[PDB]
Each structure stands twice: as structure tokens, then as C-alpha cells.
Design a protein around this ligand. Sequence first.
Ligand SMILES: OC[C@@H]1C[C@H](F)CN1c1ncnc2[nH]ccc12
Ligand SMILES: [Cl-]
Length: 167
Amino acid sequence: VNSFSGYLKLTDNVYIKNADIVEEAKKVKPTVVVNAANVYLKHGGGVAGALNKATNNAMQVESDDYIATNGPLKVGGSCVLSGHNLAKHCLHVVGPNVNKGEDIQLLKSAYENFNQHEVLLAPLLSAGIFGADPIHSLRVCVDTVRTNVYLAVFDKNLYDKLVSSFL
Ligand SMILES: OC[C@@H]1C[C@H](F)CN1c1ncnc2[nH]ccc12
Ligand SMILES: [Cl-]
């Protein structure tokens, strides 16, 4: 039993809700919140910009030190950093950004990072400003993640389409 509330159950392990991931994280304070990161951890907009803003830019400061030490992530890769005031940890995961021409096949590799964590709050990888089809992202999530994932979808119209079209 966990403290996630109001989610629709899609499969044994995948749950979905129309919610702002920032407000969800502040309420639940999950062990792991997933960020929709880029390889430079530049949290400018989309999910990343919103999460970073909610940390008063502390996420960005921590991220800049991480990059200065380690260099950029790989597309499909991840790193674990602090969750600041939002969660114990933030798993920064880089899905392919279609608006940069990145290979959508890497979306499965990106979701594989979730399997290293028993329970996660997450957005749909490569959705929004990363330019992939969210219906496809949900499909890959369901077919790749085996740990317990609680998906927050910001747009109510999109949430309804994901549920009604879910196979
Ligand atoms: O599944 C994540 C959905 C799809 C798209 F990627 C953006 N999005 C969000 N969901 C909840 N809160 C959010 N805050 C900022 C963005 C955002
Ligand atoms: Cl977005």
C-alpha cells in the first residue's frame, strides 16, 4: 500500500492520472520523481522547467555541478540526483526529443531506467515538447516498465484520450 490517490489502474503495475506532476510530488513526496530531462540537464521548460521552478532553481544548481563533473547524459540514459522539496530522489531520464531528430527506438531504453526503482511518480517520456506521440509513449511504458509506475498527465484532454484508446 502507498499514498498515491485517484489513479486509474491500467495494468498490474501501471497507474495513470490527470495531474500536474509538481503538485502531485508536493502532496505525495514520493521516493522517486522522474524528470523529463535532456542530456545537459538544462531544465528550461516542459516537465523539467516546472519541477526545477518548484525547487527554487536548486535542481538546476545541483545539475550544473553534476554535468561539470560527469559530462552529458546519453539519450536513453539517466542519473539519480536529489528530489529537493519534491521527493527523496529525482531520476532524470532522457527520452528522445523528436524535435531534435532523435531515434524514437531509444524511448524503450529510456523507460528501462524505471526498472531500477520499485515505485516511481513519472510523466510520459518524450511527450509534450519532446514531440513524440503520447499514445505511443504510454504503450512503450506499459510494455517496458515492470516496477510500479504512477503516471501524471497534465492535459485533461490528453488524459481522456490515453485512457479511452488504451488497449
Ligand atoms: O505525462 C506527462 C504530461 C505529458 C507532457 F509530457 C507534459 N505532462 C505534464 N503532466 C503533469 N504535470 C506537468 N507539468 C508540466 C508538464 C506536465
Ligand atoms: Cl511538456
